[PDB]
């Protein structure tokens, strides 16, 4: 009642998490769709390998036999939550004009941290799936570790003729600062002071900065940054709209304990990959999601899968 105002000054969030839907040209989708169970699998028809065969009109001889199969996509359900927060009595307990289930700053920070956790889990799962699918490049032995745009051209090389589908890069801040420093001292002079400040990669692909820990590994010399480029709708996040929050008062001790706990869930899915629930678990951990060997490759071609990861030091 002294401040008599909501303390929004609280550092509710620091990492930039505006990475959903149109913020990435639709690379990371954040649809709100509710689905049951711990899996959401859908099956499309598999592509027949020897559909077109050489034929000998003069003599057909033996006749082979071809069969059509059916591949399965997967979407593993990930459950998160909040540790029990004992709300302090404080002195700012005047009647709150606008009601908040948790009150004070709990939800003000919880919304941002929920979005941050969703984005971090999605990025980690994308990296794991791309590494398990072979869509990975490790430019770390050569030079400083990151080139100006030759690094991106390598990912274009990896993805092939369908490189026009990749249209956005998600990168940590340090790679973009390295790119800025390289641009300022242009060895092959192609940057003037007017165009030294460029966000894209000289191919029409905007670069988006995020400080997610899922894109940084190691420390000191082993410090590595992971810049991953996504196609359209490469990483899908489905909110299950099952949020439940409670405020409980514990009694019996010298003073009352007013606890708060929240609960929600969401789905993750990477275009062209399936989560090996047999290898992993029913409710994967962020470590389990980021771990490879749990992400099988479903699409017959790497061009069909959405995304490539570029590793630079």
């Amino acid at each position: 009642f002294n401040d008599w105002a909501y303390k929004t000054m609280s550092e509710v969030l620091d990492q930039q998490v505006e990475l959903f839907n149109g913020a990435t040209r639709g690379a990371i989708i954040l649809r709100s769709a509710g689905n049951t169970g711990d899996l959401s699998e859908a099956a499309f028809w598999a592509k027949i390998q020897g559909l077109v065969r050489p034929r000998d009109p003069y003599s057909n001889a033996d006749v082979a036999a071809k069969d059509l199969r059916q591949l399965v996509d997967n979407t593993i359900k990930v459950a998160s939550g909040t540790p029990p927060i004992n709300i302090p009595p404080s002195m700012l307990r005047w009647i709150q004009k606008n009601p908040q289930e948790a009150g004070a700053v709990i939800g003000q920070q919880l919304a941002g941290d929920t979005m941050q956790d969703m984005l971090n889990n999605g990025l980690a799962a994308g990296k794991a799936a791309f590494t398990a699918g072979g869509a990975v490049h490790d430019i770390s032995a050569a030079g400083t570790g990151l080139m100006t745009q030759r690094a991106f051209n390598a990912a274009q090389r990896i993805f092939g003729d369908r490189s026009t589908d990749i249209q956005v890069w998600v990168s940590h801040s340090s790679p973009l600062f390295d790119l800025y420093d390289n641009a300022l001292a242009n060895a092959e002079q192609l940057y003037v002071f007017g165009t030294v400040n460029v966000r894209a990669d000289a191919f029409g692909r905007p670069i988006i900065i995020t400080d997610s820990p899922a894109l940084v590994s190691g420390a000191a010399e082993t410090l590595r940054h992971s810049t991953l480029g996504l196609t359209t709708g490469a990483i899908l996040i489905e909110q299950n709209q099952d949020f439940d929050s409670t405020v409980v008062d514990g009694t019996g001790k010298q003073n009352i304990t007013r606890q708060y706990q929240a609960e929600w869930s969401y789905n993750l899915g990477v275009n062209g990959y399936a989560y090996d629930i047999a290898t992993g678990g029913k409710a994967p951990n962020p470590t389990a999601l980021a771990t490879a060997a749990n992400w099988d490759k479903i699409s017959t071609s790497i061009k069909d899968t959405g995304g490539v990861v570029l590793v630079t030091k």
Partner: protein, 450 residues
């Protein structure tokens, strides 16, 4: 971060404490008792440190009584302002959308005006904001949400250049609806043009929108910001002191005296025996640690033993002080409480009627001017006729009108001195009619029943 969209002027921050105390006084006993830590000082810090002391303080406050007269003063003053309905001059069917729902929530302009007058009486500050979405909406913003304004002498004219007010709405954009989304509206004026932005804090990020200049039906944009700050003093953004500060303070002092009086009544209010000249031997022989005090049960006492019942008598100094404060409260405005013991003869109060209803008249005129300006700006949005007014009731102390009053007003209408609309409004003022003017005209168009 300061210098943000959510920065608050210094004087508003200074006034927030007084506004909070006024709101707590308006709420009633619960707010004062819960926040009694600063209202009622602890009798001593020595026990206040200890937990036994804070338990004693809890018992002290919980026994107390909150009079709650300041809130009644407001309610009574508002009832004095609002009898029947405020009149509206100008086209009605051409402003019907504003009358039916002033802000698209089914709330008539009468009830929004009532709330605006309530806030201009309790803490004495408010604001009306006219915006376009086709229909213009007239907002109501509490004084707690006004957080920035700026004044300049533009060619010698006081021009409100900047004004940022807090805008609140429940977040419903899918997800899980963690907390409600919060909005700030930056109203700016440059070179005689009204600009605005909308700052939304979603997921911890402050979104911003491109500058837009709202334009009238004919165009030409604006030279003034469609936002008026009305208060108890005048319709200027400068903060005007709240009318209810003194009464709140007197009520708080009366509350702490009531706490002391209730403690005294609890402890010393019960008569007590106080047997004097008693020895342990006599007590243990005949009394035996228990005294029967009924009418049929008698008790003996030894030689030179004097039993005397003791309890604190009435007309004490604490009660005298709290009665003095009650008199002081009714002395500074009698809207809070009445006294049937007090006999006042009619015909004398007409001299002091002007000085007393000073706050009522000032608030009524301020709210009428603010709402007239807001309706004119809404008309500018719609391109309607500007020559309109919305004036509240300036005729306080209302009652049912006597037969002689009705005869006088009819005689005034029969002569060309009061028009039919004015006479009908006067009759409706005294509760002698309810039908509107046009319906009565159409009903009296017919011939006499006979």
């Amino acid at each position: 971060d300061s210098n943000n969209i959510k920065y608050v002027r210094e004087d508003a921050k200074k006034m927030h404490k007084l506004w909070a105390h006024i709101r707590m006084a308006m709420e009633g006993s619960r707010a004062i008792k819960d926040n009694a830590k600063e209202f009622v000082p602890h009798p001593d810090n020595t026990k206040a440190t200890t937990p036994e002391g804070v338990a004693r303080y809890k018992a002290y406050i919980e026994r107390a009584v909150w009079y709650g007269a300041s809130a009644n003063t407001v309610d009574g003053m508002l009832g004095q302002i609002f009898a029947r309905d405020p009149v509206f001059t100008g086209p009605e069917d051409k402003f019907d959308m504003l009358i039916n729902d002033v802000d698209g929530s089914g709330l008539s302009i009468h009830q929004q005006a009532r709330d605006s007058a309530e806030d201009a009486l309790s803490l004495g500050r408010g604001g009306l904001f006219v915006d376009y979405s086709a229909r213009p909406y007239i907002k109501f913003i509490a004084a707690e949400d006004i957080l920035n304004w700026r004044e300049r002498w533009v060619n010698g004219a006081k021009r409100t250049t900047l004004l940022v007010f807090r805008e609140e709405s429940d977040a419903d954009d899918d997800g899980y609806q963690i907390y409600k989304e919060e909005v700030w509206r930056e109203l700016r004026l440059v070179d005689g043009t009204y600009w605005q932005r909308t700052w939304r804090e979603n997921d911890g990020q402050l979104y911003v929108d491109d500058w837009i200049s709202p334009t009238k039906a004919d165009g030409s944009q604006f030279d003034e910001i469609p936002f008026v700050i009305f208060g108890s003093k005048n319709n200027d953004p400068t903060i005007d002191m709240p009318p209810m500060r003194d009464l709140v303070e007197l009520n708080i002092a009366h509350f702490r005296n009531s706490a002391d009086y209730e403690e005294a009544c609890f402890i010393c209010g019960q008569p007590t025996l106080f047997l004097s000249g008693l020895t342990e031997h006599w007590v243990k022989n005949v009394l035996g640690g228990a005294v029967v005090i009924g009418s049929r049960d008698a008790v003996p006492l030894p030689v030179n033993a004097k039993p005397e019942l003791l309890q604190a008598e009435g007309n004490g100094m604490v009660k005298e002080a709290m009665d003095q404060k009650e008199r002081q409260m009714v002395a500074l405005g009698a809207k809070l409480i009445d006294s049937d013991k007090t006999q006042r003869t009619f015909g004398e109060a007409s001299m002091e009627a002007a000085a007393q209803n000073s706050v009522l008249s000032r608030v009524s005129k301020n709210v009428s001017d603010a709402y007239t300006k807001a309706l004119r700006w809404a008309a500018m949005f719609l391109g309607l006729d500007e020559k309109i007014e919305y004036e509240l009731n300036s005729d306080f102390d209302i009652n049912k009108m006597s037969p002689e009053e009705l005869a006088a007003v009819i005689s005034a209408w029969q002569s060309n001195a009061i028009s039919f609309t004015e006479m009908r409004w006067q009759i409706k003022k005294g509760g002698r009619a309810y039908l509107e003017d046009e319906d009565m005209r159409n009903e009296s168009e017919q011939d006499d029943p006979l």
